[PDB]
């Protein structure tokens, strides 16, 4: 942590985001610009990963969509995200839930806390 | 970065633990300069645990220090000396518990030797 790099990028840090961890289920309200209109598309899913620090911090959300697993990685402080709602806090035992990529159904379920 | 000292990971750990306990017991050992330079950081980190003094700090030190007799008269282990005598001596000192002094090369292999001692 160069203090200088933090100080330059402190402006663009979002203050409105909830505290979440890997394992928690989010609704990420993603601003989609399909030509003229700016609509919101909700990506609901489990946080599998959160890495980096400051403005470079990213997080990955996973969902099954029509029988196909989909992951979306976002910068934490991206202005493309309108809102993050924490749907459900998870009970997991690690920072990276890459083991969920193999699993499906009852095996893939996480205990609520 | 850190030095490998011509040893595998396990051999190096074992050697640094041996040297760490040797310095705690003797307060002053002669070794190769490059061994002494690596030993500084390891020993000073052990003294930091000693100065903390709590059970958690003692168990961390116990994972590193060898089960060797520091004082045969009192029946004091090296771990006990670290948490008793060494920790007390360096209560007010903030880092820099050791010093290296260079001796010059030994005969058999020209290896640059050094004294490392507790300050």
């Amino acid at each position: 942590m160069q203090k200088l790099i933090e100080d330059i990028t402190k402006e663009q840090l979002r203050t409105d985001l909830p505290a979440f961890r890997p394992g928690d289920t989010l609704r990420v309200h993603v601003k989609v610009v399909e030509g003229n209109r700016e609509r919101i598309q909700i990506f609901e899913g489990v946080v599998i990963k959160r890495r980096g620090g400051g403005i470079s911090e990213t997080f990955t959300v996973r969902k099954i969509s029509y029988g196909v697993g989909v992951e979306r990685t976002f910068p934490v402080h991206t202005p493309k995200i309108a809102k993050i709602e924490v749907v459900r806090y998870g009970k997991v035992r690690r920072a990276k839930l890459y083991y969920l990529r193999e699993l499906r159904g009852k095996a893939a379920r996480i205990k609520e806390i | 970065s850190y030095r490998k000292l011509g040893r595998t990971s396990a051999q190096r750990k074992a050697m640094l633990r041996d040297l760490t306990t040797d310095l705690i017991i003797n307060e002053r050992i002669e070794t190769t300069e490059t061994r002494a330079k690596e030993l500084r950081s390891v020993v000073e980190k052990m003294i930091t645990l000693g100065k903390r003094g709590d059970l958690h700090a003692r168990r961390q030190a116990a994972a590193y220090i060898r089960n060797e007799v520091a004082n045969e008269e009192n029946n004091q282990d090296a771990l006990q000396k670290l948490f008793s005598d060494i920790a007390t001596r360096y209560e007010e000192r903030q880092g820099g518990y050791t010093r290296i002094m260079k001796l010059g090369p030994r005969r058999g292999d020209g290896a640059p030797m050094a004294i490392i001692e507790l300050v």
Binding site: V32, E34, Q41, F43, T58, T60, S65, Y66, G67, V68, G69, V70, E71, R72, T73, F74, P75, T78, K80, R101 | -
Partner: protein, 122 residues
């Protein structure tokens, strides 16, 4: 990252179930295709009944990949599988329906018909 010999699932009802990539189109020595890119492929597994048959050389557009795609906003999308859709030379799907989600990148590469038929577009 799809290359020659990569097998893909077929995300449509054209008949083909699995294809094998013969060629990544769009330049000499082009090794890798990603979402939106067209590939030449042979049908290795086909549904016994449908239009497209086993052993046919066909063109297909890649609609999902494991490697995924980066976006200008610094966000990424990835799928659990590599999937394509069999197309004609005018980029229209040979099958009538699309199965599973597809990437938004198909809109950029002028595959509006596939995007319109897709159940979800992420």
């Amino acid at each position: 990252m799809i290359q020659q010999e990569t097998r893909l699932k077929v995300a449509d009802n054209s008949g083909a179930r699995e294809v094998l990539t013969i060629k990544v189109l769009g330049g000499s020595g082009r090794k890798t295709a990603n979402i939106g890119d067209v590939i030449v492929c042979t049908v290795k597994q086909a549904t016994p009944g449908g239009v497209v048959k086993k052993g046919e050389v066909v063109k297909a557009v890649i609609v999902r990949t494991k490697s995924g795609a980066r976006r200008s906003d610094g966000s990424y999308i990835s799928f659990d599988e590599n999937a394509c859709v069999i197309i004609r030379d005018d980029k229209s799907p040979r099958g009538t329906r699309i199965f599973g989600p597809v990437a938004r990148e198909l809109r950029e590469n002028n595959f509006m018909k596939i995007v319109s038929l897709a159940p979800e577009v992420i």
